[PDB]
Amino acid sequence: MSEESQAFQRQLTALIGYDVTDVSNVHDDELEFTRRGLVTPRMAEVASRDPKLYAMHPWVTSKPLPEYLWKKIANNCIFIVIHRSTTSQTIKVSPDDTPGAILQSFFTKMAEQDFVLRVCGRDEYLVGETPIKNFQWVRHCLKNGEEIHVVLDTPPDPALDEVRKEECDRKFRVKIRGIDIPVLPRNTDLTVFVEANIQHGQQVLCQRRTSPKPFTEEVLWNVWLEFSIKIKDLPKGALLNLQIYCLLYYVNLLLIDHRFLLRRGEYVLHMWQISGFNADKLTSATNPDKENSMSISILLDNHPIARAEMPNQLRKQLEAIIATDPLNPLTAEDKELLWHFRYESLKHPKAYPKLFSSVKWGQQEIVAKTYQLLARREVWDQSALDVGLTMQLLDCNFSDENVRAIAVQKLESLEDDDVLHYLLQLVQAVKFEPYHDSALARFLLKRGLRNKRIGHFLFWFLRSEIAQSRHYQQRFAVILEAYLRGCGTAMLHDFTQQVQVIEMLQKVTLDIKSLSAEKYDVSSQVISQLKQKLENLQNSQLPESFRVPYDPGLKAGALAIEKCKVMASKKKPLWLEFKCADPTALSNETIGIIFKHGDDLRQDMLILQILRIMESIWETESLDLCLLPYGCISTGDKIGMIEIVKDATTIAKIQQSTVGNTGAFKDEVLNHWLKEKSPTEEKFQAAVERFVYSCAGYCVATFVLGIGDRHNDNIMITETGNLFHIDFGHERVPFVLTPDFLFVMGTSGKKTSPHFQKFQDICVKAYLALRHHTNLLIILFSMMLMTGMPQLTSKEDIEYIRDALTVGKNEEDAKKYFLDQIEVCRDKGWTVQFNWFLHLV
């Protein structure tokens, strides 16, 4: 390597948080093979992308402009203000106008083709052949009733984006020699055995055990486990799962490797423990900690890898099967039915998941017929993209390259707008890939290199996992390094600044938790310290500026120390606020961010993101439920940052405001509070207006996910009437619709107001509109559970959501069912709200 070539990797490693060159936690070369694998897709994409558009990353959408935003223009005319030094002219514009089309208009109307229309305050540009109606920023503006302010400045230089110059029939069998652990201790000497399983996509193909022996730090068997599957019947991506019961430890090994070579020889694998089903169990990675872990020792010794129409009534039997949720499990009679009629099943795209689950992948001949089936793909290829189907075929139930590859094929037609919607879940879905290199891994790579916004979020999502997942940090690290090597020095520089900032801040956050009561209230001595230490960074540490990781358009400047604090929580998160480093920004409002250690924010991200998906699903049907999914990025182990929504108050505090007698609750306060924060009667009804939708919004969403049973503290509202929930870190009620809410709406205990009619009316559309994507939500959710929560019941836990969405019912029985939830609120008022801790001591 070149000397300076090695100062780079060094750079890359500290941007990643893992050393992708290290080879001390491998027993083969699949990861290095995969660094090399991706060089071609990396370069292929770097080469093909437009320098000048990649530079500006215009945020754009082909979707139609929703009905609700259409009424927001009663004139087929849009007002775009333009700024240059002092003065600023305003220009009438048409929804269909174009950036070029108005730079030209601007010059004409003025008593040249080498500038650009940027936004004030942001690195967000209005550039390229898009209708102005189709720029995200513009659609966001019309929503909130804000003028569209744009500065005329010169395009950024593609030079800065430059990328550094790239330089038998034998039954299979396995010999278990022994296990070994440095220190077992627990209590009683329960016997112990191994469980050797041959798995494909969680499907078990075969199973064997060893004579149970009482637990001792060393245990030797020398035993050959004689499997039933034939060496030649082994399918690609087939794991030898090895397990230790007394379930204490597990480890995996791909039996067929990354060059289609059957595995062979001695292996000494270091096993993972079990914390007092989920995707960590599937990992091909071994435990880096070779000092404390249990160890299994094994030996392989065993290469290649080369008409008629249905009756009228089975057809119906089949169509029934195909017409059922992603969970409703298949019986052998189902499975044999889908298979005998592979070809009729193939004419229906929605059958595909179920159909490829009906494959016996422990048989060369039947896998072989499957690929023939995949060959003749005319009908799948033609179909519209169902992100649901696509995702179901990427989950843990499929471990065949070819199945998975045809799903990723289907993603290719997603525009960035949508890639951003599903990016997080796709990145988590990489966990279910048998092999480090993969269609999906290469697709995520392509799309981040093609679009700086996707590149940005892709970086954090990957860095988030590497940082806190030993099971997958290796595989993800290889993919990030892949990314980082083609994003350009422009971006590499932003990531370096961002990584600096957050690391300094995370120092400050933990040092503050250590110095404070186990929970009780911030001392004055903390307020001193916190402000003191921030100033101690504000000088010659904190970089000048940095992109806000949850909003990469926004560049934070210097801290506003006066406005910083430690939050009186229980953990001690930081309430930090920054000046905006952009002078062009037509405001003085700071950029608030919270920094928390002690909550696993990955759950929060996952939830915030589903929330976004919901908001776009209602977009498809012309509905706007005014959610407020604030930004929240996970950065490390139980540690990350959070956006501060401006001018929002907890509902707890608006109640607790008036005495706040631990729980004496009054129905009047909210509506009063709104008028206080509303100077004119005008802006008030607009607040009541929003509340209705915002409230309606969260009632539906919150219920569906089964996180609707929450305390006051964790629900906030803006001075401007937007209600929202927070803190989605992990008798009853369906959701929170307290009498104080209903008061704003007009009701007061088993009555009906004009606005409450409205409320119900909204909720029902919203509930119905979501059921139009039942499949989508069931798959997103269940994937959430496997890759995001603790170890879950791969039946019991997920089952809730099916019920919530009232699967297998008509719209009436379902609308009814929801209205009944509305009622269980009006029957319990404050009771569990009041019950929300009456427990304290």
Binding segment for ligand JZY (CB under 6 A), chosen from 60-68, 196-204, 639-647, 656-664, is 639-647
Among 650, 685, 753, 760, binds ligand JZY (CB under 6 A): 650
- Number of other CB atoms surrounding residue 770 within 10 Å: 21
Q: Does 45 contact ligand JZY by CB under 6 A? A: no
Instruction: Please tell me whether residue 648 binds ligand JZY under the rule CB under 6 A.
Output: yes
Q: How far is the CB of 510 from ligand JZY (least distance, A)?
A: 15
Strand 546-548 relative to strand 591-597, pairing:
unpaired
In angstroms, give the least distance from the CB of 610 to ligand JZY.
Answer: 15
Q: Is residue 573 a contact point for ligand JZY (CB under 6 A)?
A: yes
**Pick 639 or 779: Cβ nearer ligand JZY:** 639
Q: Please, which residues have CB within 8 angstroms of residue 676's CB and are 6 or more apart in sequence? A: none
Please list the helix, strand and coil fractions of the chain in percent, rounded to the nearest 5, in that order: 45, 15, 40
- Cα separation, 210 vs 99, whole angstroms: 71
Taking the C-alpha atoms of residue 274 and residue 247, their distance in angstroms, rounded to an integer, is 7
Q: Which is nearer to ligand JZY, 296 or 601 (CB)?
A: 601
C-beta of 450 vs 725, nearer to ligand JZY: 725
What CA–CA distance (Å, rounded) separates 126 from 135? 7
Does position 557 bind ligand JZY by CB under 6 A? no
Select 564 or 777, whichever has its Cβ closest to ligand JZY.
564
* Cβ-based nearer residue to ligand JZY, 486 or 592: 592
Pairwise CA distance, residues 493 & 160, whole Å? 10
Closest CA to 284 of 633, 489, 31: 31
The burial of 581, by beta-carbon neighbours within 10 Å (0-12 exposed, 13-18 middle, 19 or more buried), is given as middle
| 707 interacts with ligand JZY by CB under 6 A | no
Q: Is 630 marked as a binding-site residue?
A: yes
**Residue span 69-108 as binding mask against ligand JZY, x where in contact by CB under 6 A, dash where not:** ----------------------------------------
From the list 461, 630, 741, 756, which residue makes contact with ligand JZY (rule: CB under 6 A)?
630
Is there a binding annotation on residue 282?
no
Q: Which is nearer to ligand JZY, 283 or 738 (CB)?
A: 738
Which of 184, 254, 561, 567 is the binder for ligand JZY (CB under 6 A)? Answer: 567
> What is the smallest separation between the CB atom of 592 and ligand JZY, expressed in angstroms?
7
With contacts defined by CB under 6 A, name the span among 77-85, 200-208, 347-355, 643-651 that binds ligand JZY.
643-651
Q: Max Cα separation, the chain?
A: 95
Is 592 flagged in the annotation as binding? yes
Site membership for ligand JZY, residue 560 (CB under 6 A): no
> How far apart are the C-alpha atoms of 455 and 448, rounded to whole Å?
4
Token representation of residue 709: 């049973």
Is 37 annotated to bind a ligand? Reply is no
Question: Which segment (94-102, 320-328, 502-510, 561-569) binds ligand JZY by CB under 6 A?
Answer: 561-569
Query: Minimum Å distance from CB 567 to ligand JZY?
Result: 3
- CB 655 to ligand JZY: min, Å: 13
Judged by CB, which is closer to ligand JZY: 347, or 570? 570
Annotated binding residue at 261? no
> Which class for 840: exposed (0-12), middle (13-18), buried (19 or more C-beta within 10 A)?
exposed
Q: Which of 374, 560, 568, 707 binds ligand JZY (CB under 6 A)?
A: 568
Contact between 578 and ligand JZY by CB under 6 A: the answer reads no
Q: Does residue 348 have a known ligand-binding role?
A: no
d(CA 391, CA 425): 9
Task: Report CA torsion sign: 194, 195, 197, 203.
Answer: negative
Among 43, 366, 510, 644, binds ligand JZY (CB under 6 A): 644
Contact of 534 with 577, CB cutoff 8 Å: no
CB 569 within 8 A of CB 559: no
Q: CB nearest ligand JZY: which residue?
A: 567
Residue by residue, DSSP assigns 375-387 as: H--HHHHHSPP-H
Residue 565 binds to ligand JZY (criterion: CB under 6 A): yes
Piece in contact with ligand JZY (CB under 6 A), picked from 19-27, 512-520, 595-603, 614-622: 595-603
Is 599 assigned to a binding site?
yes
User: CA 448, CA 445: separation in Å to the nearest integer?
Assistant: 5
Residue-by-residue DSSP string for 566-617: E-SSSS--EEEEEEES-TTSS----EEEEEEESS-HHHHHHHHHHHHHHHHH
Q: Which of 727, 746, 760, 826 binds ligand JZY (CB under 6 A)?
A: 727
- Strands 546-548, 565-566: pairing is unpaired
Task: Give the C-alpha separation, 59 to 66, whole Å.
Answer: 17
Cβ of residue 728: shortest distance to ligand JZY, in angstroms?
7
Nearer to ligand JZY by Cβ, of 129 and 647: the residue is 647
**Alpha carbons 69 and 59: distance in angstroms, whole number:** 18
Q: Is 656 in the site for ligand JZY (CB under 6 A)?
A: no
End-to-end CA distance of the chain: 64
The count of residues interacting with ligand JZY (CB under 6 A) is 21
Q: How far is the CB of 726 from ligand JZY (least distance, A)?
A: 4
* DSSP single-letter state for residue 232: G
**594 touches ligand JZY (CB under 6 A):** yes
Residue 604 engages ligand JZY in binding (rule: CB under 6 A):
yes
Beta strand pairing call for 191-200 and 148-153:
unpaired
Task: Tell me which stretch binds ligand JZY (CB under 6 A): 351-359, 565-573, 619-627, 698-706.
Answer: 565-573
Q: 796-804 and 774-788 are packed helices; what angle lies between their axes, rounded to 10 degrees? A: 150
Comparing CB distances to ligand JZY, the nearer of 127 and 601 is 601
Q: Which stretch binds ligand JZY (CB under 6 A): 8-16, 139-147, 562-570, 833-841?
A: 562-570
Q: Is 371 assigned to a binding site?
A: no
Token digits of residue 180: 């070994």
**Computed from CA positions of residues 835, 837, 839, 841, in that sequence, does the dihedral angle turn out positive or negative?**
negative
Pairwise CA distance, residues 238 & 253, whole Å: 8
719 near ligand JZY (CB under 6 A)? no
Binding residues for ATP: 592-601, 627-635, 724-730
Chain residues that interact with ligand JZY, rule: CB under 6 A: 565, 567-569, 573, 575, 594, 596, 599, 601, 604, 630, 642, 644-645, 648, 650, 716, 726-727, 729
